[PDB]
Every structure is written in structure tokens, then in C-alpha cells.
């Protein structure tokens, strides 16, 4: 006597929490301890364990665009001044300096799953006689691309 | 009393993982040890790895 | 399309008893799926003797 509106039902949810990566920080404070840095001086300033990648459970494949931002102001300090992201496990995949201001360094299934540590390591002559306390150096990381 | 849509499925997944190879760097400090680089001077420096 | 049949017995086939059987050639239309689908034929005795 009735005619069904044949129409039944199916559902489910998909729930996206977090986001593919945790940059954490570890700053430098690169005249060091037990060290000196003096104007016009030259030399090299190495720090291990700068910037640790902390991906989930499902993130493989991690597009990191690093940038300099202030470089424009250390570049009346600074003479030169090349930073080398000591990568995964012994790759150095990123180069910053005053000029060129970008790196592209990225990680894959093998230097993710077994802790990425990012270091830095710095080659800087002072300008000529300046003599300064505490200067920011700030570097932008952006998550271009995950899978 | 039905008309089947004649349509099956196959399917497959690619698995593209890795990038093809890895730059191990070991830099070389090439005054070295126990040697000298004096200005105006001449030479070579060897680093094998 | 042609569906009528005309067939006729006489003295020597009804006199050993009158089998018809049927032989069909069949192509289901594509994809049709049915169940116990009716075949009706109609046997009129037009003319007896
Ligand atoms: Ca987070
Ligand atoms: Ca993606
Ligand atoms: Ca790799
Ligand atoms: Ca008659
Ligand atoms: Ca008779």
C-alpha cells in the first residue's frame, strides 16, 4: 500500500588535526662562550642543533622554504656571510647569504623517519670596525609542499 | 528485470619515496694539520673522501 | 516477430502418440538479469477430423 522512497544511507567522518610539521627552534648566540668576536674579525661559528623537523606519524615528504628576511639590514654590519644548513645525516641542503636569499632544502622518507636536525653552520667577516650587541638574524620557514 | 551497467574495477598504487641519491659532504679544512699554508705559497692539498 | 505456427498431424503421427518438443536459440539483450521470466503459447485446435 505505500510506496517506498527507496533511498538508505551511508556516512563517515575524516578528522585533520594537526599540521605536517613542527619547527623547533633552538637559537644561537654565536660570539658563543668562552669565545670572542671582534670587529673586522673573521671567522666560523658552528651550531649542531638549530632547527629540529618533528613531523606526524604520516608525513613523509616535507618542501622547506628557509628565508632571510633581515639580511638587508646585516648587510651594513656584515661583509660576508654564507650559512650552510647542515641537513639530515651529513647533506648540507640549503646555502643563505646576503645576495641570494632562499634555500629549498627538503626531506624524504629516510632523513624524516629518523629525526631531522637542521644546523647551521656560519663564515662571517665583520665589517670594518663595527661594533654591535645582540643582532637578530630571523629566518622564515615555509611548508611549501608536504605529502 | 535489471539492466547491469557492465563496468568493473582494477586498481594499483606507486610508491615514489626516496630522491635518487644523497650528497654525504665531509668538508675539508686544508691547511690541514701538522702542515703550513704560508702567503705567496704554492702547492697541493689532497682529500681522498 | 513471426509468431504464429500452424502444425498438423494425421493418421500416422497421431497413431504412435504426438511428442512436440522445443529447441530455442536464445541471445539475452545486454546486461538483462532476470528470474523465472514467463513463456505463454496458446494452442488453438482449429480443425480436427
Ligand atoms: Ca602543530
Ligand atoms: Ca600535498
Ligand atoms: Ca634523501
Ligand atoms: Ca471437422
Ligand atoms: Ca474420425
Same mark, same amino acid.
Given at each position: 500500500?505505500?510506496?517506498?522512497?527507496?533511498?538508505?544511507?551511508?556516512?563517515?567522518?575524516?578528522?585533520?588535526?594537526?599540521?605536517?610539521?613542527?619547527? #623547533?627552534?633552538? /637559537?644561537?648566540?654565536?660570539?658563543?662562550?668562552?669565545? @670572542? %668576536?671582534?670587529? *673586522?674579525?673573521?671567522?666560523?661559528?658552528?651550531?649542531?642543533?638549530?632547527?629540529?623537523?618533528?613531523?606526524?606519524?604520516?608525513?613523509?615528504?616535507?618542501?622547506?622554504?628557509?628565508?632571510?628576511?633581515?639580511?638587508?639590514?646585516?648587510?651594513?654590519?656584515?661583509?660576508?656571510?654564507?650559512?650552510? #644548513?647542515?641537513? /639530515?645525516?651529513?647533506?648540507?641542503?640549503?646555502?643563505? @647569504? %646576503?645576495?641570494? *636569499?632562499?634555500?629549498?632544502?627538503?626531506?624524504?622518507?629516510?632523513?624524516?623517519?629518523?629525526?631531522?636536525?637542521?644546523?647551521?653552520?656560519?663564515?662571517?667577516?665583520?665589517?670594518?670596525?663595527?661594533?654591535?650587541?645582540?643582532?637578530?638574524?630571523?629566518?622564515?620557514?615555509?611548508?611549501?609542499?608536504?605529502?
Amino acid at each position: 500500500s505505500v510506496t517506498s522512497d527507496r533511498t538508505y544511507y551511508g556516512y563517515g567522518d575524516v578528522s585533520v588535526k594537526n599540521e605536517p610539521v613542527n619547527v #623547533v627552534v633552538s /637559537p644561537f648566540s654565536f660570539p658563543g662562550a668562552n669565545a @670572542s %668576536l671582534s670587529s *673586522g674579525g673573521q671567522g666560523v661559528f658552528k651550531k649542531p642543533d638549530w632547527i629540529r623537523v618533528v613531523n606526524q606519524s604520516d608525513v613523509e615528504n616535507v618542501k622547506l622554504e628557509i628565508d632571510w628576511v633581515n639580511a638587508n639590514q646585516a648587510a651594513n654590519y656584515f661583509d660576508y656571510a654564507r650559512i650552510l #644548513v647542515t641537513g /639530515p645525516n651529513g647533506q648540507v641542503k640549503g646555502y643563505l @647569504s %646576503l645576495q641570494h *636569499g632562499k634555500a629549498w632544502i627538503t626531506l624524504d622518507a629516510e632523513e624524516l623517519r629518523e629525526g631531522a636536525v637542521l644546523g647551521a653552520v656560519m663564515y662571517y667577516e665583520v665589517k670594518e670596525g663595527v661594533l654591535a650587541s645582540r643582532l637578530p638574524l630571523v629566518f622564515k620557514v615555509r611548508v611549501v609542499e608536504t605529502g
